Amino acid sequence: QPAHLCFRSFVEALKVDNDLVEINTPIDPNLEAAAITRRVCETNDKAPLFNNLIGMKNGLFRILGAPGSLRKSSADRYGRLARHLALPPTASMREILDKMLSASDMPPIPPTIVPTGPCKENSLDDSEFDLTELPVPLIHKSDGGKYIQTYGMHIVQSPDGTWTNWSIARAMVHDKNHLTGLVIPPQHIWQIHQMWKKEGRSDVPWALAFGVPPAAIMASSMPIPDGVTEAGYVGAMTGSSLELVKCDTNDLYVPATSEIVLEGTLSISETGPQGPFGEMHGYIFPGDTHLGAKYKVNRITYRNNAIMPMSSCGRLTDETHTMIGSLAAAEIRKLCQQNDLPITDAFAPFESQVTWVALRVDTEKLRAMKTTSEGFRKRVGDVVFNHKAGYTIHRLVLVGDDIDVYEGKDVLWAFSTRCRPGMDETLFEDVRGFPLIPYMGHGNGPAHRGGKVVSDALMPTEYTTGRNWEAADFNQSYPEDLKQKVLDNWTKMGFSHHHH
Amino acid sequence: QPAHLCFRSFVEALKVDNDLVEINTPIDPNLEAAAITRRVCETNDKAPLFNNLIGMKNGLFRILGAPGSLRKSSADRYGRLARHLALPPTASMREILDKMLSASDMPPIPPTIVPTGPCKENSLDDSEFDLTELPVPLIHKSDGGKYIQTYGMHIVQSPDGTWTNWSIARAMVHDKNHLTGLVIPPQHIWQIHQMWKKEGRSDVPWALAFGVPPAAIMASSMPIPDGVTEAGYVGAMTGSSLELVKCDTNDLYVPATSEIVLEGTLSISETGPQGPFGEMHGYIFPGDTHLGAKYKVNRITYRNNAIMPMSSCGRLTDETHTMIGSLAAAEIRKLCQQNDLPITDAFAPFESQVTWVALRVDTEKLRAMKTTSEGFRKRVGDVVFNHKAGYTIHRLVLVGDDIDVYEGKDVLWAFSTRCRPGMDETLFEDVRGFPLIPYMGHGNGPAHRGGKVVSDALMPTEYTTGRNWEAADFNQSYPEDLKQKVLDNWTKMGFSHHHH
Ligand SMILES: Cc1cc2c3c(c1C)C(C)(C)C[C@@H](O)N3c1c(nc(O)[nH]c1=O)N2C[C@H](O)[C@H](O)[C@H](O)COP(=O)(O)O
Ligand SMILES: Cc1cc2c3c(c1C)C(C)(C)C[C@@H](O)N3c1c(nc(O)[nH]c1=O)N2C[C@H](O)[C@H](O)[C@H](O)COP(=O)(O)O
Ligand SMILES: [K+]
Ligand SMILES: [K+]
Ligand SMILES: [K+]
Ligand SMILES: [K+]
Ligand SMILES: [Mn+2]
Ligand SMILES: [Mn+2]
């Protein structure tokens, strides 16, 4: 099966890329596996595959860390991510995000049901597993539980059957047959749960599939629109219908090649302790446990020699930056264009801990609007900060055409030099805030409201007659033929490879 | 003579360091020398010494570019700067700034007058030079003149004789015997000029010395206090009295080993066109000429085989970042401590284009103050933004003890995650602004007022009971003995030098 359609094949691809380290000696899931993965993420090293996990029994489980993290070279920086999508490993971020957006103007390709698959090779009923006896990792020393769920996909369906959502949300082991996790507004798992709670009749049928098709986990991490079934979006993206097998204990469908599947219910009544967890902004608040959603597990099915993917998330750079930030930015780009805003590109700079999105403006179009900074900031912020795609983002930075928003040095330069603090910004206090950011949930103000800003790094003539400066840089301050002369004589004169 | 006391010796030191490239074939001062230097600065390469400058006659002049720019390795990143000060080339930024601050609590060591020096080896009177016939560089393609003065020191004295100031301010050739340049408030060259204009009787006696003692050019770039003679501060810093020779045509004193000296007057009445110039924030606005101060040159004296230092300034990283930003930050650190604020460290992040200063707070001291963010922000901003040392800085970022302010990734992380936009900030509109920043002089508001902010990236418990989080990073999320195990087994398992 192709790498983008089968996780097992994706792991092969990483090896074949010289982007895997297989570790075949015993590794402890209590902190050691996650510490190694954390180091990998902080240094852009090869992904670790832990083939000999202390506590692995009857096939459950090996771990792959850092599945969506960065490579060290500039030339294939995003290669892991490209390998989720059948793109060349040298793909740019623009190309990856365009691929993720491509299905937005296509007919869905609904999934195909097949009678069996590798995820049915082994099973454990409700008398044969205990989630506390599996080698679930402790990912950070202060975590409030062992977070089994950092890179699987939750599957839930609206009561009427018309929408089946796939998404990533964290969850940890509560006891032998339950998890607790985040289920928070405005996320689709929360929106579907609320539909079942209003109906009031039963718990939510649920599945959690680990080691799903890579193209599916990327859509799971993206805020595609309300009511859109991720399976059909992924089908259209990839050009092929995804093969799914029915769960044994409910009527949900899971990818046929899933490594591990949990089947059960998400309660409409019960909660349990959840967190704290070392999180995407780089923090953990030891002891900050709160009540979360509660999941009951009735069945486990799994591939022979099952592999659990794991995100050891925190400070730069891991899946919570490369996928949450970039995929939100992608959706925000499209949302702005559909609202007739002249945005060409969007990216969440890593340097902002993916709390900012930089929006590149087509300033010829802006000039034809005959508008001002106050009016345009307000219009952009109203569109983005009132939408779910803007949930995680607290600062929007508007930049003109000369800025590559995929280069954080250039975004920082523009922000620092073109946006006058206060005057060139509009604060938004009456929008939904992202409580996970420390300055929100652990800060001085309301955890769930406000704290957002549009920072205009467009210069005044970009609204009127056009850019009126040149950069004081090698590229812009010197004629072409001089520049080329310098470059051609560089090593000759005495001064100091693209792939590397 | 030691490198820190004699520019010629400093050039030797750079060679001996393998930090120089001598270029002995002809190089054009029209753009080529500056383009090569710009490339060096953008890549942290070796400093260029142009020994064969097209237009060099009778010893005037060779050029050294990038005298205070960065080296490529992390281990001696600041080595050029260390070589200005007799510090080891591996000195940290903290050590460099401490050296620059050391004289603030010492008695001055006044300069020593000597009868002659190398700067008297050659002379040109007022019938024998023409500034338009010297190989003055055109530094950026759109500059409004040839900027002879990018790394020399202006020398002016108060009418009463009690204060002699040394400072860097840009100047360009106006005609055969005049320069024009910036002389703007609150700079000391401007403050002294205003004293002569109020007296109204003559033009200001003036000298401009190029290739001065390196320790002197660093104090020239630092906002030491009003009324303090830089020569005596440098004397105390270095532990030795600087040797100075009288000018021939006025009673000012110049460093004995200066490479090139201009003697003349700074007018109290006349102006002339000045600028535009590619500047420290990375911009030039083609055609934005304004009236500047006008200098008359009556005499040139110079060393045999004179060398002119040059800053090809603009986008990162050059002298305008390493010296202006860092030395302002140093003075701001001291200013805050003298106002009883619990600041331990300050640095202007390069990523902010040296428009921000991050202030590290001693949070045990802050807790004993029993204060709040609003009150503390206001107090810090009032101290800094009302003082000349804060002139160039538009954003102050307060951070706690866990942040290394000399590491821009950590400042960015703290700012992005700990400061709630709006709520955790105080805007300052009734302070002097720095018009050079594009969003000020070319922006939407008053060029000379406002646009400043204090951003509090202290978390709430840092004011009360103490830090209540741990970072989700390798360092803080894992015990010591696990961390060391990981490191010790790193290359063994399969994963990937300090000097490099
Ligand atoms: C890639 C990725 C995404 C997420 C998460 C993680 C990873 C690796 C964890 C490591 C597990 C950490 C956790 O904070 N986490 C997470 C989460 N969204 C939440 O509601 N809850 C979460 O606990 N998202 C983000 C969501 O996946 C996206 O916001 C997506 O858009 C949701 O799908 P939908 O609601 O739009 O269908
Ligand atoms: C290191 C350095 C410093 C400065 C400059 C440059 C360099 C390389 C130029 C390349 C020439 C560019 C120019 O923008 N420039 C410059 C300038 N200050 C100005 O009033 N005018 C200027 O044109 N400073 C900063 C000042 O040197 C400091 O603010 C210093 O504090 C002043 O001394 P004082 O007034 O405190 O005695
Ligand atoms: K999704
Ligand atoms: K602006
Ligand atoms: K000075
Ligand atoms: K704060
Ligand atoms: Mn969805
Ligand atoms: Mn001074």
Residue numbers in the entry:
A (entry chain A), B (entry chain A): 4 to 499, 502 to 505
What does the article say, verbatim?
Prenylated FMN consists of an FMN molecule modified by the addition of a fourth non-aromatic ring joined via N5–C1′ and C6–C3′ linkages between the flavin and prenyl moieties. Following binding of prFMNreduced and formation of holo-UbiD, the cofactor undergoes oxidation to form the catalytically relevant oxidized prFMN species. In the UbiD enzyme family, Arg173, Glu277, and Glu282 (A. niger Fdc1 numbering) form a conserved ionic network.
In the latter structure, the amide group of Gln277 occupies a similar position to the carboxyl of Glu277 in the wildtype protein. The presence of both of these adducts indicates that oxidative maturation of prFMN is able to take place for E277Q. In contrast, only very low levels of decarboxylase activity could be detected for the E277Q variant by analyzing for product formation using HPLC, suggesting an upper limit for kcatapp of 0.3 min−1. No significant exchange can be observed for E277Q, despite the detection of low levels of activity by HPLC. Surprisingly, activity for the E277Q variant was very low, although crystal structures reveal no significant structural perturbation in the active site.
